């Protein structure tokens, strides 16, 4: 009971991957774990139902290890109110909000550690390195975020076309650090990573600014190896993914030590090889 | 209350250590960007040889970690005094008897000779059991330093995995790399090779590679890549074969720990850490 924890996650391949459950068995097989998703009946009601799904990927493998090593059981669910975490009128949504408002004991997923999130949740040690990277077509001449094509976009004719996926740690950072770039960028907001890669490949976008761990993976997987991150995969505002816990959580110490043991004993490299490899 | 006792260690480019001038102050110098170099007085032993008395002397300290300390002290409004770790070591737990004991900066933090470690101090399981680490102020890893001309592939090179006395490699005693090779049974063959040749300090190891007395030095990538950028007879090979971060070290009940970590995050996010990288780490090639 006290050892059985509500845990929240969010699909973001390859770190978390969501598949439909076998209708004939209603059982998750192979390397997957049960994860449920509250799905609305209609838009004129608050009624919904929990749909049984199955989850796998790099952070799911981390969760299974933590569950075995720290000795807990869990009911994993997928967030439905936002995504990673954003503060709206001083109210947190996404995985962060689930934790802040005690609907989950922890958030396990591709959850970026930053300062304003750390004011409302406790984060584990980082277990995957990330930050902010820039994806372009190969040969695009852009030094980085501080490139003048980004900072002073209208100093060029035609101006550089570049966007991010809004409402996560990347946009929060750009808004705080580069006001003119941020207000220029918003017209190029992309609904998600797959849209952004299509926009790049078809010439609708010159650059895509986003989470380094996801972009570096998408680069290694790109069909034909045409899309690259700048600076051989350079990262601005280096940070990592962390497990988010409630402030003062008594699980933090054992989670931290477990993750550090996984790193120290080489177990993390096996997961990286399993989930994060590509032929570019 | 009291001024915080900061313990650090000599380790360029994070911590430079130089003599004071005659009058006991530190010489005015200017960075690659033209800005004054912030120096602090740091007391430390002048005799660093093993088994000798450790009577201390005022010296000058500066570099990436000293700039970071200054930013922390201004941000959270503490005063401080800096000293160099007496035994010259980062810190491991060793058997004494059935008791165990921490040496180096870890030992000083735990015994209260220090209140905060500000150093290129790797975060690892063994130390986290005893002290509190900040979120990493620097992400890096391990790589391998060799004389130019020496060809080895990396951590899986047969001259490392099937070792002989013809090709000697080593790391620093009582360091996180020492712990790493002792911890993993898969690395035990290399561990037993290195335990005959480990050096008291990184600078001594690096010099032994220049003098063709050490064929390979396994050490932190933030340090080795800086050395390879200044000494063009030395190179790294194989890229990072393990990834780890440096964090600030405090006792688990420090009142400062939440605000230290938040300041580190803030500094990654607003470009301060990048500025430090441009000033101290990445500027030559
Ligand atoms: O980087 C973003 O803006 C969104 C994002 C993308 C991948 C992983 N984490 C996040 C996050 O905000 O936690």
Numbering used by the authors:
A (entry chain B): 5 to 284
B (entry chain A): 3 to 98, 101 to 289
Please give me the paper's original passages concerning this structure.
N-Methyl-D-aspartate receptors (NMDARs) belong to the ionotropic glutamate receptor (iGluR) family and are ligand-gated ion channels that mediate the majority of excitatory synaptic transmission in the central nervous system. Hence, GluN1/GluN2 NMDAR activation requires binding of both Gly and l-glutamate, whereas GluN1/GluN3 NMDAR activation requires only Gly.
However, the electron density for the UBP791 ligand in this structure is fully continuous and substantially more ordered suggesting favorable binding of UBP791 to GluN1–GluN2A-4m LBD over GluN1–GluN2A LBD. The crystal structure of the GluN1–GluN2A-4m LBD was obtained by implementing a modified agonist co-crystallization and soaking protocol.
